[PDB]
């Protein structure tokens, strides 16, 4: 890349982040399209976040990605939030449209976009959502807003159970999608849920390093063919869940899929251009 | 350049700016040394400057360059200024050291460096400074600090005249150099100086488009060989001042040399490294 006075800046505000891959990925996509943008990472926490936004505006940055621990706080500094973001209550993308700041959660749109790109239609379907954190909430919010008939959220009795309930409330009160929350301990309600589910989505940490050798699904007999299973965990690339999904004839979507489309969604929001997904997938070494 | 999450930001706050060459020049130099920094220009004016400084600190930028029209205002937003910066009253460089901002004016140090680099010792010498703008003021303050004998400043009857007056006072009260503000209209008193001068420095817009074929020097007469003629205008690389210069046999220092050294200084202030000046010169075609 050759940066000149013409280039505008796109940030990523989080902490820690100096070891983030996003900058390399977006800058590779940007250079490929020969666009006058540069994507950079800045160490920002809740204390400096306010001033960083003030910077975003004064310096006229095109926008910035947002990650831990500013995801929720960020909602307070934009001028407008999308419906899905309002349900999630957290954003990972900000777009500065000439001083007017728009907040987005591309984790939700990217996951669903990955689904649709596979030829799958979520309209009127049923999803078994594992989790209630940022990934799950974002997936579910977007999913509801895109047509899901019902979401059967399952979450253990931890610090996320109450968030689940509220999420269920917000979604039910502002969408035509019906959301229910069930304790992941009620193994009976789970099996039946999965049997009636068109999509099984894992938004939990389960399956991710170092606790890779584990899956929230007891036995492969719980899954059925035709069923679509999506994994948020992309580390390992092949979780246990995804491994079982194959041993059941289930179609699937891995973590890299959500990652690339999540990044593609931001790319388009900032440049208005399509994402060179294939190229980026290849250059970042995700194909193997 | 391959920007990653490890690169730190170095900006340029000014407006207009999207057509500046500092970015490429600084980014060519940085990539040349494989340094984890990226120089970027931001369209910022007096109104956005306060917010821009908040970003500089909050985003933890390594620093930023400052140009029109934020040079003067920038002094009010730093924690510490250099003696020259205080005399000049404006800065073009800001360095952020873990939250503390230091202001510098490399225009002066840069122009003086170019002088010294040609084998000239400004100490105890007389200079005829044309203009009182950002350039002239920077060169003068720095030149004074570095031993200049006296500064005979010449500026027309515009708003800068008063600026010249105020500038003369500041220097004459904090340096051993003696400055005098003379009306560029007194064509007579201009000879009395240009005659007994060691160096003639132009920091006015004359010489630069749309004032190309113009010069504050009526006849080659007033100028002879050996005389040092420094030109700040670099737009028309060969200003009418140079024509008369490289025709009267007076060694000169074009705006390219000043530009390169003023940039070298900022580079080093930010990265702590030596500026690949020769490399940049060639790549930027300044050669
Ligand atoms: N592919 C992508 O682009 C992408 C994007 C975002 C997050 N992720 C991944 O998704 C996962 C979730 O991230 P998050 O931000 O939503 O996390 P979070 O901490 O906000 O949520 C963790 C969730 O998982 C559940 N959970 C964790 N351990 C559990 C266990 N042992 N048993 C039952 N439930 C458990 C919790 O109840 C909670 O709802 C992470 O592995 C993350 O790396 C991937
Ligand atoms: N070498 C470098 O890196 C460098 C740095 C800064 C400025 N410059 C150049 O130097 C010039 C001056 O820049 P500045 O920032 O000092 O400008 P400024 O606006 O601050 O000052 C303009 C000066 O020129 C004088 N002037 C303008 N028209 C005049 C005229 N017709 N007759 C007599 N005097 C006249 C004014 O009195 C004033 O003192 C510009 O052309 C600029 O491109 C070069």
XYZ file of C-alpha atoms and ligand atoms in Angstrom:
663
model
C 0.000 0.000 0.000
C 1.160 3.549 -0.784
C -0.389 6.073 1.573
C -0.723 9.690 0.477
C -2.553 12.794 1.681
C -5.651 11.444 -0.101
C -6.189 8.471 2.176
C -8.845 8.549 4.915
C -8.492 6.584 8.151
C -10.536 3.707 9.462
C -9.925 2.770 13.076
C -10.371 -0.136 15.454
C -10.875 0.974 19.056
C -10.232 -1.677 21.668
C -7.690 -2.815 24.250
C -5.713 -4.996 23.946
C -5.578 -5.042 20.108
C -1.940 -4.682 18.908
C -2.086 -8.319 17.885
C -5.353 -8.027 15.959
C -5.565 -9.490 12.454
C -8.314 -7.117 11.276
C -5.906 -4.379 10.263
C -3.959 -6.707 7.998
C -7.119 -8.198 6.549
C -8.936 -4.940 5.858
C -5.755 -3.281 4.530
C -5.154 -6.205 2.214
C -8.724 -5.919 0.912
C -8.375 -2.147 0.625
C -5.147 -2.257 -1.354
C -6.598 -4.937 -3.623
C -9.457 -2.623 -4.512
C -6.942 0.179 -4.742
C -9.097 2.319 -2.450
C -7.775 5.433 -0.613
C -8.375 4.047 2.888
C -6.045 2.860 5.647
C -7.257 0.691 8.542
C -5.402 1.108 11.855
C -5.558 -0.150 15.422
C -5.583 2.137 18.464
C -5.382 1.081 22.109
C -8.531 2.561 23.612
C -10.453 1.583 26.749
C -13.592 3.040 28.345
C -11.618 5.961 29.764
C -10.210 7.193 26.497
C -13.147 6.069 24.312
C -14.983 9.420 24.583
C -11.987 11.402 23.385
C -11.319 8.870 20.629
C -14.833 9.435 19.231
C -14.282 13.186 19.458
C -11.172 12.410 17.430
C -13.100 10.275 14.953
C -15.218 13.347 14.240
C -12.563 16.134 14.317
C -10.106 14.251 12.151
C -12.986 13.182 9.887
C -12.055 9.499 10.021
C -14.272 7.425 7.732
C -15.123 5.255 10.723
C -13.811 2.627 13.116
C -14.219 -0.917 14.214
C -14.973 -1.391 17.909
C -14.096 -4.258 20.209
C -13.612 -5.213 23.874
C -14.165 -3.338 26.077
C -15.939 -0.570 24.191
C -18.651 -2.585 22.455
C -21.496 -1.569 24.816
C -20.168 1.876 25.688
C -19.965 2.655 21.953
C -23.763 2.614 21.660
C -23.822 5.824 23.641
C -21.604 7.743 21.178
C -23.321 7.223 17.817
C -26.159 9.285 16.419
C -28.061 6.297 15.102
C -28.248 2.554 15.799
C -29.761 -0.082 13.569
C -32.759 -2.107 14.797
C -30.602 -5.210 15.274
C -27.990 -3.198 17.221
C -30.678 -1.726 19.433
C -31.703 -5.268 20.414
C -28.123 -6.412 21.044
C -27.054 -3.253 22.882
C -23.504 -3.488 21.474
C -21.771 -2.564 18.228
C -18.476 -3.472 16.594
C -18.692 -1.007 13.715
C -19.103 2.751 13.470
C -19.576 4.632 10.242
C -18.895 8.365 10.134
C -21.063 9.773 7.359
C -19.760 13.319 7.204
C -20.181 13.918 10.945
C -23.246 11.714 11.391
C -22.282 8.523 13.201
C -24.053 5.216 12.473
C -23.609 2.166 14.708
C -23.709 -1.405 13.410
C -23.146 -4.943 14.621
C -21.646 -6.810 11.684
C -21.244 -10.018 13.697
C -24.981 -10.479 13.334
C -25.270 -9.451 9.683
C -22.087 -11.339 8.823
C -23.268 -14.579 10.397
C -26.664 -14.395 8.687
C -25.042 -13.279 5.425
C -22.880 -16.379 5.615
C -26.056 -18.439 6.057
C -27.838 -16.912 3.067
C -24.709 -17.157 0.870
C -24.814 -20.903 1.431
C -28.151 -20.939 -0.355
C -30.020 -21.319 2.914
C -33.143 -19.260 3.588
C -33.718 -18.351 7.245
C -37.124 -16.796 6.556
C -39.691 -18.511 8.774
C -37.238 -21.079 10.147
C -36.406 -22.141 13.684
C -32.971 -21.719 15.226
C -31.560 -23.318 18.339
C -29.199 -20.684 19.640
C -26.542 -21.755 22.109
C -25.417 -18.737 24.099
C -26.428 -15.287 25.241
C -23.197 -13.326 24.986
C -22.174 -10.932 22.216
C -21.977 -13.422 19.376
C -25.295 -15.141 20.175
C -27.168 -11.953 20.906
C -25.966 -10.388 17.687
C -26.788 -13.539 15.678
C -30.231 -13.812 17.233
C -31.073 -10.128 16.841
C -30.196 -10.152 13.205
C -31.800 -13.545 12.678
C -35.119 -12.348 14.098
C -35.032 -9.205 12.038
C -34.450 -11.261 8.913
C -37.424 -13.578 9.187
C -36.725 -16.391 11.647
C -40.063 -17.808 12.808
C -38.779 -18.572 16.272
C -35.533 -18.718 18.222
C -35.090 -21.293 20.960
C -32.284 -19.932 23.042
C -30.498 -22.245 25.426
C -28.145 -20.960 28.116
C -26.907 -22.418 31.401
C -27.603 -20.848 34.781
C -24.688 -18.422 34.768
C -24.163 -14.679 34.535
C -25.734 -14.681 31.079
C -29.072 -16.278 31.921
C -30.635 -12.968 32.969
C -29.238 -11.252 29.915
C -30.893 -14.003 27.867
C -34.295 -13.235 29.378
C -34.025 -9.506 28.651
C -32.787 -10.254 25.150
C -35.772 -12.555 24.742
C -37.996 -9.718 25.968
C -36.575 -6.992 23.701
C -36.736 -9.223 20.627
C -40.293 -10.370 21.309
C -41.444 -6.826 21.905
C -39.990 -5.387 18.709
C -40.096 -8.202 16.129
C -42.490 -10.879 14.895
C -39.983 -13.517 15.968
C -40.817 -15.419 19.158
C -37.914 -16.046 21.490
C -37.802 -18.482 24.378
C -35.011 -19.135 26.830
C -34.350 -22.549 28.283
C -31.747 -23.711 30.816
C -29.164 -25.817 28.995
C -29.623 -28.307 31.850
C -33.157 -29.290 30.753
C -31.813 -31.940 28.414
C -35.365 -33.030 27.549
C -36.408 -29.625 26.207
C -33.114 -29.513 24.318
C -33.476 -32.754 22.324
C -37.000 -31.758 21.345
C -35.772 -28.261 20.460
C -33.073 -29.648 18.179
C -35.563 -32.070 16.619
C -37.794 -29.147 15.692
C -34.907 -26.924 14.698
C -33.921 -25.948 11.199
C -30.721 -24.282 12.382
C -28.381 -25.125 15.241
C -26.107 -22.205 16.118
C -23.339 -22.212 18.655
C -22.481 -18.781 19.971
C -20.774 -20.023 23.119
C -17.109 -20.380 23.955
C -17.508 -24.151 24.020
C -15.267 -25.786 21.424
C -12.669 -22.998 21.516
C -9.096 -23.354 22.786
C -8.017 -24.690 25.111
C -11.324 -26.352 26.003
C -11.565 -27.566 22.392
C -12.390 -31.151 23.337
C -16.008 -30.412 24.217
C -19.405 -29.734 22.630
C -22.766 -28.632 24.029
C -24.399 -31.525 22.168
C -24.335 -34.854 24.062
C -24.922 -37.316 21.228
C -24.977 -37.143 17.424
C -28.374 -38.812 17.622
C -29.678 -35.426 18.794
C -29.042 -33.921 15.371
C -30.856 -34.827 12.157
C -29.843 -34.676 8.490
C -30.815 -31.604 6.532
C -30.294 -29.642 9.734
C -27.894 -26.704 9.368
C -25.262 -26.224 12.074
C -23.227 -23.011 12.333
C -20.170 -22.513 14.543
C -18.977 -19.171 15.857
C -15.743 -20.657 17.210
C -13.049 -20.471 14.541
C -10.260 -21.660 16.828
C -9.965 -24.594 16.290
C -11.134 -24.336 12.724
C -12.968 -27.669 13.172
C -14.782 -27.692 16.491
C -16.246 -30.831 17.985
C -19.743 -29.643 17.132
C -18.882 -29.159 13.466
C -17.208 -32.550 13.541
C -20.403 -34.186 14.827
C -22.466 -32.187 12.324
C -20.709 -34.012 9.502
C -21.251 -37.381 11.170
C -24.967 -36.691 10.813
C -25.145 -35.471 7.245
C -25.719 -31.940 8.549
C -24.781 -29.035 6.327
C -22.488 -26.518 7.999
C -20.916 -23.055 8.218
C -17.608 -22.664 10.065
C -16.172 -19.745 12.036
C -14.035 -18.414 9.212
C -17.218 -18.025 7.228
C -18.713 -15.640 9.778
C -15.326 -13.917 10.182
C -14.891 -13.157 6.485
C -18.497 -12.012 5.962
C -18.374 -10.048 9.209
C -15.338 -8.241 7.785
C -16.855 -7.999 4.342
C -19.918 -6.284 5.852
C -17.778 -3.582 7.512
C -15.690 -3.187 4.363
C -18.811 -2.427 2.322
C -20.179 -0.081 4.979
C -16.997 2.011 4.842
C -16.140 1.803 1.129
C -19.505 1.117 -0.447
C -17.555 -1.542 -2.406
C -17.815 -5.365 -2.440
C -15.327 -7.351 -0.375
C -12.674 -9.400 -2.243
C -13.542 -12.311 0.026
C -11.828 -15.056 -1.943
C -8.592 -13.070 -2.227
C -8.629 -12.094 1.473
C -9.480 -15.644 2.492
C -6.475 -16.841 0.520
C -4.037 -14.104 1.578
C -4.872 -14.485 5.296
C -4.411 -18.235 4.973
C -7.914 -19.383 5.962
C -8.474 -21.973 3.227
C -6.378 -24.483 5.213
C 3.885 -0.354 3.073
C 1.975 -3.120 4.906
C 0.055 -1.588 7.768
C -0.765 -3.866 10.687
C -2.250 -3.466 14.168
C 1.263 -2.632 15.367
C 1.701 0.639 13.492
C 1.325 3.905 15.329
C -0.207 6.995 13.785
C 1.438 10.244 12.866
C -0.903 12.850 11.473
C -0.863 16.184 9.683
C -3.581 18.638 10.750
C -4.353 21.359 8.262
C -6.752 22.470 5.523
C -6.545 22.325 2.551
C -4.287 19.296 2.819
C -5.403 16.443 0.571
C -2.814 17.602 -1.971
C 0.183 17.762 0.382
C 3.352 15.867 -0.275
C 4.355 15.417 3.346
C 2.460 12.139 3.630
C 4.222 10.416 0.727
C 7.569 11.894 1.660
C 7.279 10.784 5.297
C 5.760 7.395 4.366
C 8.534 6.779 1.806
C 11.083 7.514 4.521
C 9.332 5.335 7.108
C 8.915 2.338 4.853
C 12.544 2.827 3.793
C 13.544 2.170 7.410
C 10.895 -0.485 7.975
C 9.455 1.635 10.796
C 6.008 0.730 12.281
C 4.459 4.139 11.619
C 2.051 5.636 9.170
C 1.835 9.334 8.333
C -1.628 10.532 7.380
C -3.177 13.905 6.579
C -6.377 15.013 8.229
C -8.540 17.878 7.028
C -8.671 20.039 10.162
C -9.246 23.781 10.652
C -9.354 26.059 13.671
C -12.785 24.752 14.657
C -11.911 21.067 14.604
C -8.382 21.495 15.947
C -9.384 21.237 19.657
C -11.225 17.965 18.939
C -8.345 16.742 16.792
C -5.905 17.181 19.670
C -8.289 15.150 21.867
C -8.092 12.398 19.288
C -4.291 12.626 19.149
C -4.116 11.909 22.857
C -7.008 9.444 23.072
C -5.865 7.361 20.077
C -2.315 7.608 21.377
C -0.946 8.968 18.114
C 2.839 9.282 18.171
C 2.437 12.905 17.144
C 1.371 15.050 14.216
C 2.526 17.737 11.891
C 0.578 21.012 11.775
C 0.119 23.373 8.847
C -2.193 26.187 7.749
C -4.259 27.431 9.522
C -3.492 25.706 12.796
C 0.180 26.716 13.251
C -0.450 29.476 15.758
C -3.391 27.905 17.573
C -1.399 24.663 17.985
C 0.888 26.405 20.502
C -2.042 26.664 22.949
C -2.646 22.925 22.906
C 0.763 21.567 23.826
C 2.323 21.051 27.244
C 5.776 22.408 26.372
C 7.274 24.575 23.618
C 10.878 25.123 22.474
C 12.521 28.557 22.875
C 12.291 29.057 19.108
C 8.638 28.014 19.016
C 7.919 30.633 21.679
C 9.721 33.307 19.650
C 8.093 32.284 16.382
C 4.699 31.923 18.059
C 3.728 28.910 15.944
C 4.565 25.242 15.570
C 4.424 22.736 12.748
C 5.301 19.704 14.840
C 3.807 17.995 17.857
C 5.302 14.992 19.590
C 3.192 13.001 22.028
C 5.253 11.439 24.817
C 2.901 9.225 26.799
C 0.262 11.945 27.004
C 2.476 15.035 27.117
C 2.645 17.073 23.948
C 5.765 18.913 22.859
C 5.713 21.639 20.244
C 8.501 22.280 17.787
C 8.995 24.415 14.718
C 11.203 22.547 12.283
C 10.745 25.240 9.621
C 13.418 27.368 11.318
C 15.777 24.581 12.312
C 15.233 23.111 8.867
C 16.139 26.224 6.923
C 19.148 26.944 9.141
C 20.331 23.329 8.742
C 20.199 23.683 4.970
C 22.312 26.849 5.343
C 24.943 25.221 7.543
C 24.954 22.186 5.239
C 26.181 24.302 2.349
C 29.217 25.283 4.396
C 27.888 28.551 5.815
C 28.034 29.808 9.410
C 25.050 32.052 10.104
C 26.666 33.104 13.372
C 27.384 36.821 13.610
C 26.096 37.379 10.087
C 23.536 39.804 8.647
C 20.366 38.596 6.999
C 17.792 40.412 4.936
C 14.526 38.650 5.591
C 11.758 39.296 3.088
C 8.348 38.666 4.612
C 6.911 38.140 8.077
C 4.697 35.115 7.544
C 5.108 31.600 8.886
C 8.368 30.906 7.016
C 10.122 34.206 7.565
C 9.171 34.229 11.221
C 10.421 30.669 11.738
C 13.732 31.253 9.913
C 14.279 34.506 11.767
C 13.605 33.225 15.279
C 15.731 30.134 14.742
C 18.443 32.085 12.949
C 18.601 34.543 15.827
C 18.870 31.792 18.431
C 21.705 30.235 16.427
C 23.916 33.322 16.537
C 22.655 35.653 13.781
C 24.208 39.097 14.139
C 21.201 41.118 13.002
C 18.003 40.693 11.038
C 16.873 43.422 8.671
C 13.286 42.410 7.965
C 11.408 43.793 4.960
C 7.647 43.407 4.549
C 5.071 45.360 2.558
C 2.238 47.317 4.109
C -0.201 44.529 4.918
C -1.404 42.773 8.077
C 1.926 41.017 8.393
C 3.697 44.333 8.922
C 2.409 44.594 12.479
C 3.270 40.920 12.843
C 6.821 41.818 11.797
C 6.927 44.569 14.398
C 5.794 42.296 17.208
C 8.186 39.593 16.047
C 11.121 41.986 16.004
C 10.435 42.945 19.615
C 10.217 39.380 20.874
C 13.567 38.492 19.361
C 15.311 41.706 20.404
C 14.258 40.934 23.975
C 15.234 37.269 24.124
C 18.246 37.151 21.818
C 21.442 39.062 21.082
C 20.322 39.442 17.476
C 18.951 42.816 16.423
C 15.980 42.907 14.080
C 14.529 45.899 12.267
C 11.243 46.091 10.416
C 11.524 48.205 7.246
C 8.762 48.941 4.715
C 9.447 46.975 1.563
C 8.354 50.229 -0.136
C 11.476 52.096 0.989
C 13.361 50.916 -2.106
C 16.261 53.094 -0.984
C 16.780 51.522 2.447
C 16.529 48.151 0.711
C 19.771 48.870 -1.109
C 21.496 49.972 2.099
C 20.891 46.458 3.346
C 20.994 44.184 0.325
C 24.386 45.780 -0.267
C 26.018 45.109 3.113
C 24.295 41.769 3.623
C 25.649 38.257 3.889
C 22.426 36.424 3.265
C 19.172 37.338 1.500
C 16.199 35.262 2.510
C 12.788 35.357 0.873
C 9.772 34.049 2.770
C 7.055 35.907 0.859
C 4.662 34.433 -1.695
C 6.434 36.361 -4.429
C 8.109 33.899 -6.750
C 5.337 31.344 -6.318
C 2.361 31.100 -8.700
C 0.478 33.164 -9.646
C 3.448 35.432 -8.915
C 6.083 33.402 -10.779
C 7.917 35.920 -12.957
C 8.092 38.382 -10.036
C 10.891 39.152 -7.573
C 11.376 41.561 -4.706
C 14.778 42.297 -6.258
C 14.595 44.909 -9.025
C 18.073 44.415 -10.520
C 20.795 41.774 -10.446
C 23.030 44.700 -9.526
C 22.194 44.582 -5.802
C 23.336 40.956 -5.838
C 26.787 39.471 -6.473
C 28.613 36.081 -6.239
C 29.289 34.509 -2.850
C 26.110 36.129 -1.553
C 23.796 33.602 0.015
C 20.282 33.784 -1.395
C 17.757 31.551 0.303
C 14.354 30.966 -1.244
C 11.450 29.456 0.704
C 9.180 29.162 -2.322
C 9.683 25.716 -3.842
C 6.557 25.540 -5.991
C 8.194 27.109 -8.998
C 11.481 25.268 -8.253
C 13.434 27.941 -10.123
C 11.984 31.203 -8.824
C 12.902 34.502 -10.442
C 15.112 34.968 -7.405
C 17.083 31.886 -8.401
C 17.310 33.035 -12.006
C 18.981 36.250 -10.873
C 20.820 34.103 -8.347
C 22.297 31.373 -10.552
C 22.970 34.122 -13.083
C 24.733 36.525 -10.721
C 26.822 33.649 -9.371
C 25.388 33.726 -5.855
C 25.106 30.329 -4.194
C 21.534 29.576 -3.156
C 19.355 27.204 -1.145
C 16.069 26.380 -2.866
C 12.871 25.485 -1.036
C 13.534 21.798 -1.662
C 16.491 21.758 0.696
C 14.532 23.528 3.423
C 11.586 21.200 2.914
C 13.825 18.114 3.174
C 15.593 19.218 6.337
C 12.441 20.512 8.016
C 10.931 17.078 7.276
C 14.103 15.220 8.400
C 13.834 16.893 11.805
C 10.167 15.944 12.302
C 11.015 12.367 11.212
C 13.777 12.054 13.760
C 11.686 13.670 16.483
C 8.991 11.040 15.948
C 10.973 7.893 15.233
C 14.295 8.741 16.799
C 15.910 7.579 13.589
C 17.991 9.291 10.952
C 16.128 10.612 7.970
C 17.075 8.931 4.605
C 17.294 12.409 3.094
C 19.176 11.403 -0.030
C 16.741 8.585 -0.739
C 13.710 10.866 -0.214
C 15.189 13.635 -2.356
C 15.536 11.293 -5.312
C 12.179 9.541 -4.895
C 10.316 12.828 -4.417
C 12.140 14.039 -7.504
C 13.360 16.985 -5.473
C 16.590 16.360 -7.310
N -16.215 -16.049 13.687
C -16.351 -14.800 14.157
O -16.265 -13.834 13.412
C -16.616 -14.626 15.666
C -17.104 -13.373 16.155
C -17.380 -13.108 17.523
C -17.168 -14.121 18.469
N -16.678 -15.386 17.997
C -16.451 -16.476 18.954
O -17.685 -16.847 19.576
C -17.473 -17.191 20.945
C -18.352 -16.322 21.827
O -17.873 -14.971 21.911
P -18.791 -13.953 22.760
O -18.210 -12.624 22.525
O -20.232 -14.138 22.385
O -18.548 -14.404 24.269
P -19.232 -14.055 25.679
O -18.273 -14.218 26.768
O -19.893 -12.756 25.584
O -20.323 -15.236 25.763
C -19.981 -16.582 26.138
C -21.319 -17.308 26.072
O -21.052 -18.678 26.031
C -21.699 -19.334 27.127
N -20.763 -20.332 27.654
C -19.412 -20.217 27.809
N -18.885 -21.346 28.310
C -19.954 -22.127 28.452
C -19.943 -23.443 28.939
N -18.807 -24.045 29.326
N -21.169 -24.047 28.993
C -22.345 -23.486 28.616
N -22.333 -22.222 28.143
C -21.146 -21.532 28.054
C -22.125 -18.313 28.134
O -23.356 -18.635 28.832
C -22.249 -17.074 27.275
O -23.636 -16.821 26.908
C -16.000 -17.024 21.170
O -15.460 -18.321 21.046
C -15.525 -16.113 20.058
O -14.136 -16.326 19.727
C -16.407 -15.629 16.623
N 10.522 25.134 2.117
C 9.437 24.851 2.831
O 9.286 23.751 3.337
C 8.374 25.948 2.991
C 7.696 26.066 4.231
C 6.702 27.031 4.497
C 6.347 27.937 3.489
N 7.017 27.841 2.218
C 6.665 28.785 1.129
O 6.978 30.130 1.506
C 5.960 31.029 1.105
C 5.458 31.769 2.321
O 4.732 30.885 3.185
P 4.200 31.490 4.547
O 3.620 30.358 5.292
O 5.323 32.212 5.210
O 3.052 32.521 4.105
P 2.201 33.638 4.883
O 0.854 33.786 4.340
O 2.292 33.376 6.311
O 3.054 34.922 4.489
C 3.007 35.494 3.174
C 4.082 36.539 3.239
O 4.363 36.969 1.950
C 4.206 38.398 1.903
N 3.684 38.769 0.590
C 2.646 38.210 -0.107
N 2.482 38.822 -1.296
C 3.445 39.748 -1.281
C 3.701 40.655 -2.306
N 2.979 40.661 -3.432
N 4.737 41.510 -2.063
C 5.501 41.539 -0.938
N 5.239 40.658 0.034
C 4.215 39.755 -0.121
C 3.363 38.831 3.034
O 3.636 40.159 3.507
C 3.730 37.791 4.056
O 4.800 38.244 4.926
C 4.906 30.211 0.418
O 5.022 30.476 -0.968
C 5.220 28.759 0.768
O 4.922 27.849 -0.306
C 8.016 26.859 1.978
